[PDB]
Design an enzyme around this catalytic site. Structure first.
Site, short mmCIF file in Angstrom:
data_model
loop_
_atom_site.label_atom_id
_atom_site.label_comp_id
_atom_site.label_asym_id
_atom_site.label_seq_id
_atom_site.Cartn_x
_atom_site.Cartn_y
_atom_site.Cartn_z
N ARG A 37 0.78 -0.99 -0.10
CA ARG A 37 -0.04 0.05 -0.04
C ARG A 37 0.86 1.50 -0.01
O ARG A 37 0.67 2.27 -0.75
CB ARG A 37 -0.95 -0.04 1.11
CG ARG A 37 -1.82 1.28 1.37
CD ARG A 37 -2.80 1.16 2.42
NE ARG A 37 -3.36 2.55 2.67
CZ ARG A 37 -3.57 3.19 3.67
NH1 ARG A 37 -3.14 2.83 4.69
NH2 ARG A 37 -4.08 4.33 3.77
N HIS A 41 0.02 3.20 -3.47
CA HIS A 41 -0.70 4.35 -3.11
C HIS A 41 0.05 5.72 -3.47
O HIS A 41 -0.27 6.72 -3.86
CB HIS A 41 -1.23 4.46 -1.86
CG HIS A 41 -2.58 3.29 -1.61
ND1 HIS A 41 -3.61 3.69 -0.93
CD2 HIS A 41 -2.83 2.03 -2.20
CE1 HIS A 41 -4.54 2.51 -0.98
NE2 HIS A 41 -4.12 1.71 -1.87
N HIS A 162 -4.90 -5.84 -3.83
CA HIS A 162 -5.82 -5.94 -2.78
C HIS A 162 -6.03 -7.41 -2.43
O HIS A 162 -6.77 -7.90 -1.51
CB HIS A 162 -7.12 -5.41 -2.94
CG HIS A 162 -7.09 -3.85 -2.91
ND1 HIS A 162 -7.89 -3.18 -3.49
CD2 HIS A 162 -6.02 -2.96 -2.34
CE1 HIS A 162 -7.70 -1.93 -3.37
NE2 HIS A 162 -6.55 -1.83 -2.67
N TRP A 178 -9.96 -8.57 1.78
CA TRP A 178 -10.39 -8.96 0.48
C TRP A 178 -10.38 -10.49 0.24
O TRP A 178 -11.29 -11.15 -0.62
CB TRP A 178 -9.75 -8.40 -0.71
CG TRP A 178 -10.04 -7.02 -0.65
CD1 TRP A 178 -10.83 -6.22 -1.76
CD2 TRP A 178 -9.01 -5.83 -0.16
NE1 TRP A 178 -10.77 -4.77 -1.46
CE2 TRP A 178 -9.78 -4.80 -0.63
CE3 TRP A 178 -8.08 -5.56 0.75
CZ2 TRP A 178 -9.25 -3.37 -0.27
CZ3 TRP A 178 -7.56 -4.64 1.08
CH2 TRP A 178 -8.16 -3.37 0.79
N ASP A 207 -13.69 -1.57 -6.26
CA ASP A 207 -13.59 -3.12 -6.70
C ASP A 207 -14.87 -3.43 -7.48
O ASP A 207 -14.24 -4.27 -8.48
CB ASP A 207 -13.33 -4.16 -5.58
CG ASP A 207 -12.16 -3.72 -4.63
OD1 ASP A 207 -11.19 -3.53 -5.22
OD2 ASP A 207 -12.40 -3.73 -3.34
C1 HEM Z 1 -7.77 0.86 -7.50
C2 HEM Z 1 -7.70 1.97 -6.74
C3 HEM Z 1 -7.56 1.71 -5.42
C4 HEM Z 1 -8.33 2.26 -4.48
C5 HEM Z 1 -9.80 2.79 -4.45
C6 HEM Z 1 -7.65 1.72 -3.04
C7 HEM Z 1 -8.23 1.77 -1.87
C8 HEM Z 1 -7.73 1.40 -0.65
C9 HEM Z 1 -8.33 1.19 0.67
C10 HEM Z 1 -9.58 2.10 0.85
C11 HEM Z 1 -7.62 0.58 1.21
C12 HEM Z 1 -7.88 0.38 2.88
C13 HEM Z 1 -6.93 1.03 3.74
C14 HEM Z 1 -7.24 0.87 5.17
O1 HEM Z 1 -8.48 0.97 5.70
O2 HEM Z 1 -6.50 0.13 5.99
C15 HEM Z 1 -6.42 -0.09 0.55
C16 HEM Z 1 -5.59 -0.68 1.09
C17 HEM Z 1 -4.74 -1.76 0.48
N1 HEM Z 1 -4.20 -1.29 -0.82
FE1 HEM Z 1 -5.39 -0.18 -2.24
N2 HEM Z 1 -6.26 1.13 -3.42
C18 HEM Z 1 -6.13 1.32 -4.91
C19 HEM Z 1 -5.11 0.65 -5.66
C20 HEM Z 1 -4.05 -0.21 -5.02
C21 HEM Z 1 -2.98 -0.44 -5.78
C22 HEM Z 1 -2.61 -0.10 -7.15
C23 HEM Z 1 -2.28 -1.51 -4.81
C24 HEM Z 1 -0.98 -1.89 -4.98
C25 HEM Z 1 -0.90 -2.77 -6.36
C26 HEM Z 1 -3.06 -1.28 -3.52
C27 HEM Z 1 -2.55 -2.00 -2.58
C28 HEM Z 1 -3.36 -2.17 -1.40
C29 HEM Z 1 -2.83 -2.96 -0.30
C30 HEM Z 1 -1.87 -4.11 -0.27
C31 HEM Z 1 -3.79 -2.62 1.09
C32 HEM Z 1 -4.08 -3.26 2.15
C33 HEM Z 1 -3.05 -2.65 3.24
C34 HEM Z 1 -3.09 -3.45 4.65
O3 HEM Z 1 -3.55 -4.51 4.79
O4 HEM Z 1 -2.77 -2.49 5.64
N3 HEM Z 1 -4.09 -0.55 -3.45
N4 HEM Z 1 -6.67 0.32 -0.79
#
Ligand code: HEM
Ligand code: NA
Length: 248
Positions: A37, A41, A162, A178, A207
């Site tokens: 992330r 991000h 995700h 997820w 998603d």
């Molecule tokens: C497609 C548009 C995206 C949206 C709308 C989005 C949104 C989010 C949101 C809302 C969370 C939850 C944060 C939390 O409450 O801890 C999250 C977590 C995460 N995102 Fe995304 N994200 C996007 C793209 C990406 C991309 C491109 C990647 C990496 C390739 C990514 C990797 C992650 C990962 C691995 C987590 C989990 C973090 C954790 O376990 O603490 N995301 N994302």
């Protein structure tokens, strides 16, 4: 379209050693998803028209961490500081992208190519560029396409990031993993998206948007059916994301 800069042999040696230390640290700490992330991000602030933002280490800055969308990323930055201090020659920009590459590898994902040489930039981009979990396909194209300069294929593949991790009600407000295996990098994100709303698992509106879009849906279907195809497209997309604004 990339012309990677020359870095010294000492820089390259530090990259190699940092990669190994990041593997051990990330595996031990169970923080691969948080690191992915952080890397992904943070790279996503790039605007191609103005050549501003992107993966240039500005997410380290308290001012960027304070953006509400970045809730929890301060933990990631803090976790990495001791290790980063063992590699003073490396830019924070490179270190954070290397951490993202390692996060994918240690959870069983593809080997995403890594090229060093990003320079730490002084000014964080303005708040408001990150993908919004509450919006849909038009929005995803606005952010990933019009701003970042990535393709529709990249959007779907990268959404598969995700497949590891979880949302937290104190961070975004969304809550839970997820997938049933949130420390395993596989195509389960897509399988779950197709099977419907299983209790205990999360699907963001962003998603869900992939399922109803004419271009995104065939990609979801492909990745759910073919993990190898997912891994190939994911590795390509992650590399591009990690290199936005860098080396052209
Ligand atoms: C497609 C548009 C995206 C949206 C709308 C989005 C949104 C989010 C949101 C809302 C969370 C939850 C944060 C939390 O409450 O801890 C999250 C977590 C995460 N995102 Fe995304 N994200 C996007 C793209 C990406 C991309 C491109 C990647 C990496 C390739 C990514 C990797 C992650 C990962 C691995 C987590 C989990 C973090 C954790 O376990 O603490 N995301 N994302
Ligand atoms: Na998974």
């Amino acid at each position: 379209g990339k012309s990677y800069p020359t870095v010294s042999a000492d820089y390259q040696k530090a990259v190699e050693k940092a990669k190994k230390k990041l593997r051990g640290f990330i595996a031990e700490k169970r923080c691969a998803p948080l690191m992915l992330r952080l890397a992904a991000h943070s790279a996503g602030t790039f605007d191609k028209g103005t050549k501003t933002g992107g993966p240039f280490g500005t997410i380290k800055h308290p001012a960027e961490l304070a953006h509400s969308a970045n809730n929890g990323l301060d933990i990631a930055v803090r976790l990495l500081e001791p290790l980063k201090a063992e590699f003073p020659i490396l830019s924070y920009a490179d270190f954070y992208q290397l951490a993202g590459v390692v996060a994918v590898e240690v959870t069983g994902g593809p080997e995403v190519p890594f090229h060093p040489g990003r320079e730490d930039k002084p000014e964080p981009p303005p708040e408001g560029r990150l993908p919004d979990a509450t919006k849909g396909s038009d929005h995803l194209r606005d952010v990933f396409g019009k701003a970042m300069g990535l393709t529709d294929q990249d959007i779907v593949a990268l959404s598969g990031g995700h497949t590891i991790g979880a949302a937290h009600k104190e961070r975004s407000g969304f809550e839970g993993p997820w997938t049933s295996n949130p420390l395993i990098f596989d195509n389960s994100y897509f399988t779950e998206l197709l099977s419907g709303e299983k209790e205990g698992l999360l699907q963001l509106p962003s998603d869900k948007a992939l399922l109803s879009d004419p271009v995104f849906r065939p990609l979801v279907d492909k990745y759910a059916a073919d993990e190898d195809a997912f891994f190939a497209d994911y590795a390509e997309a992650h590399q591009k994301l990690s290199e936005l604004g860098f080396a052209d």
